[PDB]
Scaffold this motif. Structure first.
Motif, short mmCIF file in Angstrom:
data_model
loop_
_atom_site.label_atom_id
_atom_site.label_comp_id
_atom_site.label_asym_id
_atom_site.label_seq_id
_atom_site.Cartn_x
_atom_site.Cartn_y
_atom_site.Cartn_z
N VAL A 1 -21.91 16.72 -57.46
CA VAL A 1 -21.68 15.80 -58.59
C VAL A 1 -22.29 14.46 -58.21
CG1 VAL A 1 -20.02 14.70 -60.07
CG2 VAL A 1 -19.52 16.95 -59.11
N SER A 2 -23.23 13.98 -59.03
CA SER A 2 -23.91 12.73 -58.74
C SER A 2 -23.69 11.62 -59.77
CB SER A 2 -25.41 13.00 -58.58
OG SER A 2 -26.11 11.80 -58.28
N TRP A 3 -24.26 11.75 -60.96
CA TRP A 3 -24.10 10.72 -61.99
C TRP A 3 -24.26 11.26 -63.40
CZ3 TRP A 3 -28.53 9.02 -64.92
CH2 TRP A 3 -29.75 9.61 -64.52
N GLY A 4 -24.25 10.35 -64.36
CA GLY A 4 -24.40 10.74 -65.74
C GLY A 4 -24.05 9.55 -66.59
N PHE B 1 -11.32 8.81 -53.46
CA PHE B 1 -12.39 8.06 -54.09
C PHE B 1 -13.55 8.98 -54.42
CE2 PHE B 1 -15.41 7.90 -50.55
CZ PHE B 1 -14.59 8.13 -49.46
N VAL C 1 -9.76 6.84 -48.68
CA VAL C 1 -10.08 5.53 -48.12
C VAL C 1 -8.78 4.79 -47.83
CG1 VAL C 1 -10.24 4.59 -50.42
CG2 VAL C 1 -11.11 3.28 -48.52
N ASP D 1 -17.62 18.81 -68.61
CA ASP D 1 -18.41 17.98 -67.71
C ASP D 1 -17.55 17.50 -66.55
OD1 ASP D 1 -20.56 16.59 -66.73
OD2 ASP D 1 -20.77 15.19 -68.41
N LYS E 1 -20.39 2.06 -43.73
CA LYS E 1 -18.94 2.03 -43.83
C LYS E 1 -18.26 2.10 -42.46
CE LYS E 1 -19.58 2.42 -48.29
NZ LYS E 1 -19.72 1.18 -49.10
N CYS F 1 -21.11 7.93 -52.59
CA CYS F 1 -19.68 7.90 -52.32
C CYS F 1 -19.43 7.12 -51.02
CB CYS F 1 -19.12 9.31 -52.14
SG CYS F 1 -18.83 10.30 -53.64
N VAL F 2 -20.39 7.17 -50.10
CA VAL F 2 -20.25 6.51 -48.80
C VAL F 2 -21.40 5.58 -48.42
CG1 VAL F 2 -18.85 8.39 -47.92
CG2 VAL F 2 -21.34 8.41 -47.54
#
Ligand SMILES: *[C@@](O)(c1noc(CN2CCN(C(=O)CCCc3ccccc3)CC2)n1)[C@H](CCCCN)NC(=O)OCc1ccccc1
Ligand SMILES: *[C@@](O)(c1noc(CN2CCN(C(=O)CCCc3ccccc3)CC2)n1)[C@H](CCCCN)NC(=O)OCc1ccccc1
Ligand SMILES: *[C@@](O)(c1noc(CN2CCN(C(=O)CCCc3ccccc3)CC2)n1)[C@H](CCCCN)NC(=O)OCc1ccccc1
Ligand SMILES: *[C@@](O)(c1noc(CN2CCN(C(=O)CCCc3ccccc3)CC2)n1)[C@H](CCCCN)NC(=O)OCc1ccccc1
Lengths: 243, 243, 243, 243
Positions: C212-215, C28, C20, C188, C51, C45-46
Motif C-alpha cells: 500500500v503506497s498512495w492514492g 502508524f 511508534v 480500497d 528515524k 512510512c519510515v
C-alpha cells in the motif's frame, strides 16, 4: 482515573460503562449496578434534557473497553427532579435495563450504605473508571479499567479549598451538603469517570459512598474531586429500586 | 450573534471587547462602558478563579475586531462575591480602567436602568457582539460587530420553557430571579457575546437591561438566552460606580 | 480499509502493525512478514528522513489492535536509496527484526512472487489493515483487522484514470512503472493501511503483489489505490532477505 | 512568513491572495499580478485536479487580509501540464481574471526576469505572504502582509542539505533544476505563502525569481525553502500572457 493502576479482573464487579450511539457505541460515562435491573449514575451524564433511549446502551464490567462488548438496552432513564447542573447538586440518576442481569462473582451489584453512614476522613475508599489519566489526556487503548485509592476529606475542608484563589465569597457554599469530596494532586477521577462509583470498605463490606460528579479540572491544587453523596438520596433511589 | 447583521458604525458606542494575552490579544468576552472608567461584564468571563490583571486588556467600540486595536489596561477586576457559576447566578462583574476614556459621539457610556424600571415582556431590545453566528460556528473575518433585535420574555414563561424536554422538576427554578431572558430560535446571542449588553430603548433612551450570561446552545427551541438582570444588581454596581 | 469486513483470525497470518513511541505504542503503518526476521513495508512510512530505532516496534498478527500486544524491537531500517516521495516511486523498505519469529499456522511469512509473475488485470486480490474505513473516518475500537477484495487494474488504465479531471498532460506519467494499482469507488485501502500487503492467490498460492503506497483519497472515482509493485524490487529485497 | 515584519503599504504592489468559497472567502495561497489580466501562482494551489472556477476569487494587494476585500472572479485556470506534485516539479500556474485590472502605485504588476537571469547566492531577495509565522503557527489577526529577506543559495548546496539526515541516495536529486532555493533557520516562507512571489532587486528593477512551492517544514535545519524557478518556464507563460 488520575494516578491509578489497571484494576485486577476480580475487582469492581459492579462497574459499568454507558454508551451513546454514533460511529460506534462510544463510552461517555460510568455507572454501577445496584440491582439486577438498575444502574446508578450521575444525572449530568444523561440529563438535564430528555434523550432518545434507543441511542443509549449499557456495558457491564469489561476489563478493556470495547473489547468484549455485549451491550444492554435501556427501558427507562430516571433523573432526580432537583437536578439541573452538577455544581448546584442532586447529580444522581437511575437507568432501568430492559431485562434483569444474571449476577456472578465477576459481575454483581454494589451495596448501598445505610442512611447513617458518614465515611469520615481516613476511611479506605477507591474510585474506578475509564476516564482520562490526566487533564486533557485520554486513557489510551486498549482502555483498561483503572482504580485509584482516594483520600476522603470533610466537606467544610474542601469547601474552604475551593474558595482559595477564588473571588467567590467565603460564606457562599461551593461544596454542598449532598456532596462528598476526595482525592488530591496525585489521585483523582477525571473526565469520562462521571457517573462511576466511589466505594469504601466498611467492616468487610463495600459500600458506594458516592458518584463521580465534578471538580475544577482533575488532580489540581486546592481542587479535590467532588462526588454526589449517596446517603443523601437513598429515599429517592428506593422509590424506584426495590430493597 | 445569531440571526442578526453588521451594526452601523454609529450604533452601540458602548460595546467593548475583552482581551486575553496570548500569541495575540484575543477576544474572549464582551462588555459595556457604563461609566468613563468602568466596564460592566459577566462574572464568568473573569472568574470565579482569580485572574492576573497583566494578562487583561480592554478594547472600545470597534467595527471589525483586531483591526484598529488600542488596548486599554485594567486596574481592578471586581467579581460579585456571590458568583460561582452562571446557572446559580450573580453573573456580573466590573472592570475599572486605569484611565477614564474621553467619551465622544462615537464612543460613550450606556445608561443603567432605574431600580424601578421593569422591561415589559415583548420590549424591543438589542444585544450586540462578536460571538458565534451560530452553534459552534465562529464569526468570520473581518469580525464585524453584529446586532440582533430580540424579544424579552417573562421570567416565569422562560423558566417554564427550559423545563420542556427536561427532567428538572417544574417547581425547581432554572431561570432564577436575578436573571432575564430574551430571544427565539432565530435570534439570540452566542459563545463570544458573554458579558455583552442587552439594551432596550425606553421612553426614547437606551438602557442596559442585561448582561449576556448563558443559555442552552444558541437559538435552540424552548431555550432562550439567559441574561443577568441589571436592575437586580444596581446597588452592588453603585457601590463602586459613581453617578 | 474501505468496503470489506473484519477478517477471520485464520486469514492474513503475515499482516503486521508498525508502532511508534508516544503516550502509548501507536500504529502508524502496516507491513507484512516476508521472512522470519524481515518485515516488508512502505518507505514513506519510515522516511525519507532518518528515524530513531528506539522509537519503533513491530506487532505481529493481531485480531484487534492494542489488545494482545507483544511488541518486537527492530534492529535495522533499510529504506530504498531511490526513495523520496511516494508519487515519485521506490516507496518500499525493509525492517529487520532483532529476532526471528517462531512461525506457526496463525502467524507466518507471505510468499514473494517470482520475477516473472505479472498479476493480470481483473485478478482476485485482497488488501488488509487497520487503516481508515473511509476518507477521514478512523477504524473504530476494538480496531479489528479488516480485509477487502480489490480488482487489479492495468498500469496504463490507472495512469489514464488519474488524468481524468486533472490538468496533468496525458503523456506525463502519474502512475509509474514501479507502481501497481487496484480498487474501485467501493473498495480500497486508506490512511493507516500504508506499508500493508496486497496479496493475490495464484495457482492456488498467496503471493504479495503490492505494498500500500498512495492514492488520491480513498475509493474516489477515477482514483484507484496505488501500490509499490513488488516484482519490480525483488532484486533489491533479495539483496538483504535470504531466498 | 517566518522571521519577517509587517510590510509597509507602499511595497509589494503585485502581491495577491487567492480565495476559496466557504463560510467566507478564505485565503489559501498567494500569487502575483504579472499582467492586468493575469496572476502567477503555484500549480499545487489550484491543481492537479480541475476545480470549479466559481468557488475561486482573487484579492489584489491588501494591507490586512479580509478587511478591505474587493474580490475578483476568475475565467480560466491554466496549470503547467507537466505538474503533478511540487516535489516532482513544474509547480507553476496561471490565473486569467474576468476583467483587466486598473494599475497604480499601490497595485501594479511585477516584472518577470530575462531567460538568462541566474539570481546567484549573496544577492538579496524578499518573499511575501500571509502564511504561518512558524510551523503550525498561524498569522494572527488582523493578518498583516509580511515580508522577509531570504538568502539565496546554489541548487547543489540545498540539494546536499536535503540529503543530510535522509535515507535518499546522494545521487537521487531532490532540489531539481526547475527549482530555486532560499531562506535559513530564521527566515523563510511557510504554509499559506504558497504561490506567492520571491523577488530580487537586480538592476534597480524588481524581478520575480521564483514562486513559493515547498519545503520540509519551515525554517528547519538543513531544509531551506524551495521555489519554482520562473526563468525555467518563461516560454510556457508567454504562450498565454502577452509580452
Ligand atoms: C465526567 O466524567 C464527565 N465527562 O463528560 C461529562 C459530560 N457529559 C455531558 C452529557 N453527555 C452527552 O451530551 C451525550 C449524551 C449521551 C446520551 C445519549 C442518549 C441517551 C442518554 C445519554 C455525556 C458527557 N461528564 C466529569 C467527572 C469530573 C471528575 C473530577 N474529579 N464531570 C464533568 O466534566 O462535569 C462538568 C460538566 C457537565 C456537563 C458538560 C461539561 C462538563
Ligand atoms: C459566552 O460567550 C462565553 N463564552 O465563553 C465563556 C466562558 N469564559 C470563561 C472565562 N474565560 C477564561 O477562563 C479565560 C480567562 C482569560 C483572562 C485572563 C486574565 C484576565 C482576565 C481574563 C473566558 C471564557 N462565556 C457565552 C454566551 C451565551 C449565549 C447564549 N445565548 N456564555 C456561556 O457559555 O456561559 C456559561 C458558562 C460560564 C462559565 C464557563 C463556561 C460556560
Ligand atoms: C498510508 O496508509 C499512509 N498513512 O499515513 C501515511 C504517512 N506516514 C508518514 C510517515 N509517518 C511518520 O511520520 C511517523 C514515523 C514513525 C516512526 C518513528 C521511528 C521509527 C520509524 C517510524 C507515518 C505516516 N501513509 C496511505 C495509503 C493510501 C491508500 C490509497 N488507496 N498512503 C499515503 O497517505 O501516502 C502519501 C503520503 C506520504 C507521506 C505523508 C502523507 C501522505
Ligand atoms: C504552501 O504555502 C502551501 N500552503 O498550502 C498548500 C496546499 N494547498 C493544497 C490545495 N489547496 C486546496 O485544497 C484548496 C483549493 C482552492 C481552489 C478552489 C477553486 C479553484 C482553485 C483552487 C490549497 C492549499 N501549499 C507551502 C509552501 C512551503 C514553503 C516552505 N519553505 N507548500 C506546501 O505546504 O506543500 C506541500 C503540501 C501540498 C498539499 C497539501 C499539504 C502540503
Amino acid at each position: 482515573i488520575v494516578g491509578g493502576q489497571e484494576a485486577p479482573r476480580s475487582k469492581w464487579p459492579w462497574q459499568v460503562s454507558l454508551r451513546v450511539h454514533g460511529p460506534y457505541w462510544m463510552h461517555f460515562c460510568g455507572g454501577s449496578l445496584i440491582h439486577p435491573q438498575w444502574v446508578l449514575t450521575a444525572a449530568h451524564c444523561v440529563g438535564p434534557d430528555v434523550k432518545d433511549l434507543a441511542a443509549l446502551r449499557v456495558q457491564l464490567r469489561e476489563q478493556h473497553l470495547y473489547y468484549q462488548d455485549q451491550l444492554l438496552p435501556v427501558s427507562r432513564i430516571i433523573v432526580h427532579p432537583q437536578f439541573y447542573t452538577a455544581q448546584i447538586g442532586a447529580d444522581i440518576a437511575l437507568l432501568e435495563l430492559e431485562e434483569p442481569v444474571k449476577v456472578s462473582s465477576h459481575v454483581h451489584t454494589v451495596t448501598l450504605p445505610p442512611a447513617s453512614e458518614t465515611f469520615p476522613p481516613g476511611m479506605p475508599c477507591w474510585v474506578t473508571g475509564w476516564g482520562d489519566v490526566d487533564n486533557d489526556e485520554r486513557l489510551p487503548p486498549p482502555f483498561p479499567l483503572k482504580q485509584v485509592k482516594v483520600p476522603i476529606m470533610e466537606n467544610h475542608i474542601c469547601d474552604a479549598k475551593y474558595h482559595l484563589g477564588a473571588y467567590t465569597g467565603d460564606d457562599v457554599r461551593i461544596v454542598r451538603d449532598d456532596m462528598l469530596c476526595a482525592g488530591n494532586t496525585r489521585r483523582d477521577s477525571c473526565q469520562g469517570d462521571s457517573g462511576g462509583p466511589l466505594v469504601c470498605k466498611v467492616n468487610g463490606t463495600w459500600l458506594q459512598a458516592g458518584v463521580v460528579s465534578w471538580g475544577e479540572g482533575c488532580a489540581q491544587p486546592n481542587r479535590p474531586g467532588i462526588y454526589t453523596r449517596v446517603t443523601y438520596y437513598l429515599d429517592w433511589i428506593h422509590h424506584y429500586v426495590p430493597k
